[PDB]
UniProtKB/TrEMBL annotation:
Protein name listed in UniProt: Small ribosomal subunit protein uS2
Pfam family, one: Ribosomal_S2
Keyword terms: Ribonucleoprotein, Ribosomal protein
CDD domains: RPS2 (cd01425)
Record organism: Enterococcus faecalis
Family statement drawn from the similarity comment of this UniProt entry: Belongs to the universal ribosomal protein uS2 family.
PANTHER family: 30S RIBOSOMAL PROTEIN S2 PROKARYOTIC AND ORGANELLAR, SMALL RIBOSOMAL SUBUNIT PROTEIN US2M
GO molecular function terms listed in the Swiss-Prot or TrEMBL record: structural constituent of ribosome
Length: 222
RNA sequence: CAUGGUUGUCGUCAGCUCGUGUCGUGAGAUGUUGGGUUAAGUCCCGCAACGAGCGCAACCCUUAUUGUUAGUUGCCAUCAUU
């Protein structure tokens, strides 16, 4: 990646000055118009390190989970994670998704079962009311657990967009000792993420750019 | 005021709970809360909760129309007689 790519993506922008985090001054270059400016030089070095770390993790054969519910991030993380073949959560992270992984598997099994009924032909013979209700249920299960529907085990790495937004996701990660590679913003906390990627979380283009670098890293590892 | 069984009661009110997870040092909490909505914890949405069970609802009986099968002990429109 190039610092110019970042600048076009608008990565350098941060949040309002008052809404920053003092711990983020280690990666803040200067403040403009009441807003902070990330240090894109540290950004370039750190994104390189994250690409390297993601490549190493993929080479280990572990499983990667890309998390983002931010409107700027949901579609981007979905596409990039699907492109990498690794699993994603885009709409809403369910409490206990990983800590209660066992229970969530029951819902995933339900989702697979409802699909089998459709393929089997039960849906055709099901009464109008029954089939309609199952479509609604199936839709919700796909809506929530769809992006990880076929995950075999607990992920060995979690990529995150705006951990401050995905507070619960970071908490589950820490509980399970899952290393986190995160898009940390000027208002976010760096101490909670192993591999920090100082970047604007509120730019669609920037989220796509960073997620694309990471998806490329994992694909290259595989 | 040793009990089984049976029964009254709130009340046919929509409540009562558990599994896993999570929070709290702990008793506990969460879900069951909230915006809607319903007769309903009925249901949608959101939510560190995800599910599940007893409930609720439906399955049951009866009444309101009617198709067909049956047509005597029942019915009499078409018919003729009492
Ligand atoms: K519990
Ligand atoms: Mg209650
Ligand atoms: Mg209910
Ligand atoms: Mg809720």
């Amino acid at each position: 990646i190039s610092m110019k790519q970042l600048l076009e993506a608008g990565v350098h922008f941060g949040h309002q000055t008052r809404r920053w985090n003092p711990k983020m001054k280690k990666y803040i270059f200067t403040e403009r118009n009441g807003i902070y400016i990330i240090d894109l030089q540290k950004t370039v070095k750190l994104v390189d390190a994250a690409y390297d770390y993601m490549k190493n993790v993929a080479e280990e054969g572990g499983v990667a989970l890309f998390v983002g519910t931010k409107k700027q991030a949901q579609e981007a993380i979905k596409d990039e994670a699907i492109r990498a073949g690794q699993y994603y959560v885009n709409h809403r992270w369910l409490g206990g998704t990983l800590t209660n992984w066992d229970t969530i598997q029951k819902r995933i099994a339900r989702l697979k079962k409802i699909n089998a009924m459709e393929e089997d032909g039960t849906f055709e013979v099901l009464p109008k009311k029954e089939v309609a209700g199952l479509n609604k249920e199936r839709e919700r299960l796909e809506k929530f657990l769809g992006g990880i529907a076929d995950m075999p085990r607990i992920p060995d790495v979690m990529y995150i967009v705006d951990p401050r937004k995905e507070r619960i996701a970071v908490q589950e990660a820490h509980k399970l000792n899952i290393p986190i590679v995160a898009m940390v913003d000027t208002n976010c906390d760096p101490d909670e993420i192993d591999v920090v990627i100082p970047s604007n979380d509120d730019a669609i283009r920037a989220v796509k750019l960073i997620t694309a670098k990471m998806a490329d890293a994992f694909i290259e590892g595989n």
